[PDB]
Amino acid sequence: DIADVTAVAEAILPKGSARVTTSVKFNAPSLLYGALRDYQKIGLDWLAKLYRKNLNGILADEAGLGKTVQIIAFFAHLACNEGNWGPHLVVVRSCNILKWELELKRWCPGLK
Amino acid sequence: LVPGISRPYLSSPLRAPSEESQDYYHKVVIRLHRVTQPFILRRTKRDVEKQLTKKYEHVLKCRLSNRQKALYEDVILQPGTQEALKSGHFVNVLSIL
Amino acid sequence: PLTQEELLREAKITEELNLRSLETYERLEADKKKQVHKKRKCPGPIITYHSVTVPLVGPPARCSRTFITFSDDAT
């Protein structure tokens, strides 16, 4: 039943008024070039937990919070910690394709 | 969010809400929102402001020069400007501005 | 069928390749510095007057010394 999946998703939701006080000492993946902000690490951990539970999610962070960087970090985590080097598909606006490519090369140049 | 739902995507269970079905429609919408909310992670710039880059806006008050003052007063005191301001015609006011 | 070490080596190679590719946009610094701050000039005879601070021998004690350099033996 959908209620069970919703309960699991609610159990995966980061706790806290701002969802920024997470005890999970999530270390940035070694393949990611650069330093992630604390909220970006929290988003990355949430994405990793969603992947481990085979669940989907919606990232509704306000514009400019680095959602693309969060996705790049998620790919780096999948490659380093989950062994998921497989073909990933990203669908973006044509005006953002070059931006996404440049961000991927800047943050994780090791990915084809 | 949930691939493989027992109910097909194109077979919408709720048609246009009739007066008698508006309550049922509203309750189903509320329950659907509650079901979808745990899959949505939303954070605002205010919550992370303590970690955001800091934008500083500064207003610098500049004195009107003597030549600027003279021209400003001449334009304000021109009879045509007074007539345009008394008439209140929008385009004339915007031209003066 | 590949292992993690092979994937990491391929990732390093592709990282270098992407960095060179990315440098098509990001190599704003090195190329401009080497193109502007050239250490040579157009061909032909040149006479270089040069004067540098040199330390005195038996801030520190210093003196000024002049060198004159000629491009070719003919001049």
Side-chain angles (χ1 to χ4, degrees):
Chain A
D1 193 45
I2 197 158
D4 295 339
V5 182
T6 308
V8 178
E10 206 172 0
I12 297 163
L13 276 174
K15 295 185 181 179
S17 180
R19 302 181 185 178
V20 178
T21 58
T22 62
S23 62
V24 182
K25 283 184 181 178
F26 194 93
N27 283 339
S30 51
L31 261 179
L32 197 81
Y33 204 83
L36 292 165
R37 297 172 186 185
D38 292 337
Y39 76 97
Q40 295 171 334
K41 293 173 189 172
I42 298 168
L44 175 62
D45 181 59
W46 176 70
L47 290 169
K49 285 173 180 170
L50 284 174
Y51 175 74
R52 281 185 201 155
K53 295 289 184 183
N54 288 328
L55 297 174
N56 303 315
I58 302 173
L59 190 62
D61 284 346
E62 199 176 351
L65 289 180
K67 294 180 278 180
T68 307
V69 176
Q70 295 178 56
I71 295 297
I72 297 170
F74 178 61
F75 293 159
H77 171 81
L78 286 180
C80 299
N81 293 16
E82 303 292 343
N84 189 347
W85 298 82
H88 299 288
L89 178 64
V90 183
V91 185
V92 295
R93 293 194 300 152
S94 311
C95 59
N96 293 347
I97 296 177
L98 278 66
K99 182 184 173 181
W100 264 84
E101 187 172 355
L102 293 167
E103 290 285 342
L104 274 160
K105 287 178 185 175
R106 180 178 176 185
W107 290 96
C108 200
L111 291 170
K112 290 182 185 179
Chain B
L1 290 167
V2 187
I5 295 171
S6 79
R7 292 190 184 190
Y9 177 64
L10 292 170
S11 56
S12 174
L14 270 166
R15 285 181 183 176
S18 72
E19 272 182 1
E20 284 181 359
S21 65
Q22 185 171 1
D23 297 2
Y24 174 69
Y25 179 89
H26 191 66
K27 281 180 185 177
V28 173
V29 168
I30 290 173
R31 286 180 187 179
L32 280 169
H33 180 267
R34 278 182 183 172
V35 168
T36 44
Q37 186 171 34
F39 298 92
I40 304 169
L41 181 64
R42 181 184 178 178
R43 297 171 289 184
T44 65
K45 287 179 183 178
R46 282 182 183 182
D47 298 331
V48 182
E49 203 176 4
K50 292 182 182 178
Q51 298 179 20
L52 289 187
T53 47
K54 295 181 182 178
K55 183 184 171 182
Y56 298 88
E57 209 173 357
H58 308 275
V59 179
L60 298 182
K61 196 174 176 176
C62 311
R63 63 182 179 161
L64 292 167
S65 72
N66 291 333
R67 199 180 170 207
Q68 280 177 308
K69 277 182 187 176
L71 276 161
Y72 192 87
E73 281 178 2
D74 193 33
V75 169
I76 290 179
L77 289 162
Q78 260 180 353
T81 309
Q82 290 266 337
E83 204 167 2
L85 291 171
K86 280 183 185 177
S87 73
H89 196 279
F90 169 70
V91 178
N92 292 349
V93 176
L94 188 59
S95 76
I96 298 168
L97 281 169
Chain C
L2 291 86
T3 193
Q4 190 76 355
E5 296 186 354
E6 297 174 301
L7 265 295
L8 289 166
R9 285 192 296 267
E10 189 79 356
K12 178 177 170 65
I13 296 174
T14 56
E15 159 166 31
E16 179 171 323
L17 182 60
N18 278 323
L19 283 169
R20 299 316 180 204
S21 178
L22 177 63
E23 270 190 302
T24 315
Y25 301 81
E26 298 298 337
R27 201 169 176 89
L28 307 181
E29 188 71 30
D31 200 67
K32 287 298 303 183
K33 289 292 183 66
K34 292 172 184 183
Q35 294 271 6
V36 176
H37 300 289
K38 290 183 177 183
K39 282 78 187 172
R40 316 201 203 267
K41 201 187 181 292
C42 307
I46 52 175
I47 308 186
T48 300
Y49 156 84
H50 189 68
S51 179
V52 292
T53 62
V54 308
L56 274 168
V57 302
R62 296 181 316 295
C63 67
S64 64
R65 181 173 298 283
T66 316
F67 300 102
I68 299 292
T69 303
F70 297 85
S71 51
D72 50 290
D73 307 342
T75 52

